[PDB]
Amino acid sequence: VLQLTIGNSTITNSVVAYGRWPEFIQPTEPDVATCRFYTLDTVMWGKESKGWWWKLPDALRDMGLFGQNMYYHYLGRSGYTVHVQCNASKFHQGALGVFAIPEYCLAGDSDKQRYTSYANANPGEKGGKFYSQFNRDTAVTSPKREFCPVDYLLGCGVLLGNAFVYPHQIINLRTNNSATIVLPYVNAMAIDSMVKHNNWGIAILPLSPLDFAQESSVEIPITVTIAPMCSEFNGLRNVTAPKFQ
């Protein structure tokens, strides 16, 4: 609706998660190097798309100096401002539910429990995608150790309809083309490791299927832009180099 300027990045309803604005608690605080909007890779919303999911701060691990501070320091905390952009014409119809889940633990694909690997559990800016059904992994010799989120189960054994208990925003193409959620730092500790722990999960679900006129196939872009807010790090040491394979 109005100008949204952070650092050196400006974006032309916005919901504050849990009514709490990001806030600070000698932590290293880059007021400019990290407090800015980083744009994730655009995804394509089609008529056969089940959904998308990203993990924060994992999605910003390779975003400018924020990732460098995240890997160099031991433990850091950061709020976020997520902005989802999806522009469509008056003749397009659809709705996206954008949910910011605290501790968005997801279910695996194998009978073995909690067997998902770090590489698969931390996809980065590409994120992942939900599925209509639960596909059980059958590669016993070389298990994929990847999540198997289910659209209507939200990937966590709960019903999608109740996901609105989480902070949420609905992009309904007939009325609005963008959503904005301001997430504070949510954790059981005032500050925690970012490389191993993800504080937030952004799930975008097509509540209503996309459609345009009488066209058989229609696809429109969705772009996610995340701004770290009041991010502070502590425990400076040699750089961490996670094995992503």
For other proteins, the binding residues in 43-62 under the rule CB under 8 A are 50, 55
Minimum CB separation of residue 99 from other proteins in Å reads: 10
Please state the separation of Cα 17 from the chain's center in Å.
Answer: 14
* Site pattern 60..99 for other proteins (x: CB under 8 A): ------------------------------xxxxxx----
Minimum CB separation of residue 225 from other proteins in Å reads: 22
* Among 7-15, 26-34, 35-43, 101-109, the segment contacting other proteins (CB under 8 A): 101-109
Residue 121 in contact with other proteins, rule: CB under 8 A: yes
Of 8, 138, 141, 175, the one binding other proteins by CB under 8 A: 175
Question: Can you list the pairs that 113-120 forms with residues at least 24 positions away whose Cβ atoms lie under 8 Å?
Answer: 115/143, 115/145, 116/145, 116/146, 116/147, 117/145, 117/146, 118/242, 118/243, 119/243, 119/244, 119/245, 120/144, 120/145, 120/146, 120/147
Residue 24 in contact with other proteins, rule: CB under 8 A: no
Cα–Cα distance, 104 to 157 (Å, whole number): 11
Other Cβ atoms closer than 10 A to 13? 8
Residue 237 in contact with other proteins, rule: CB under 8 A: no
Of 69, 116, 180, 231, the one binding other proteins by CB under 8 A: 116
* Site pattern 208..227 for other proteins (x: CB under 8 A): xx-xxxx-------------
Burial of residue 76 (number of CB atoms within 10 Å: 0-12, 13-18, 19+): buried
Q: Are 198 and 35 in contact (CB under 8 A)?
A: no
Q: Which lies closer to other proteins via its Cβ, residue 36 or residue 77?
A: 77
Q: Are 241 and 71 in contact (CB under 8 A)?
A: yes
Of 65, 134, 135, 236, the one binding other proteins by CB under 8 A: 134
Q: Are 78 and 200 in contact (CB under 8 A)?
A: no
Question: Residue 120 carries which DSSP code?
Answer: H
Residue 177 in contact with other proteins, rule: CB under 8 A: no
Minimum CB separation of residue 112 from other proteins in Å reads: 9
DSSP assignment of 176-193 equals: -SEEEEEE---SSSSSB-
* Among 6-14, 29-37, 147-155, 225-233, the segment contacting other proteins (CB under 8 A): 147-155
By CB under 8 A, the count of residues binding other proteins is: 79
Of 197, 220, 223, 234, the one binding other proteins by CB under 8 A: 197
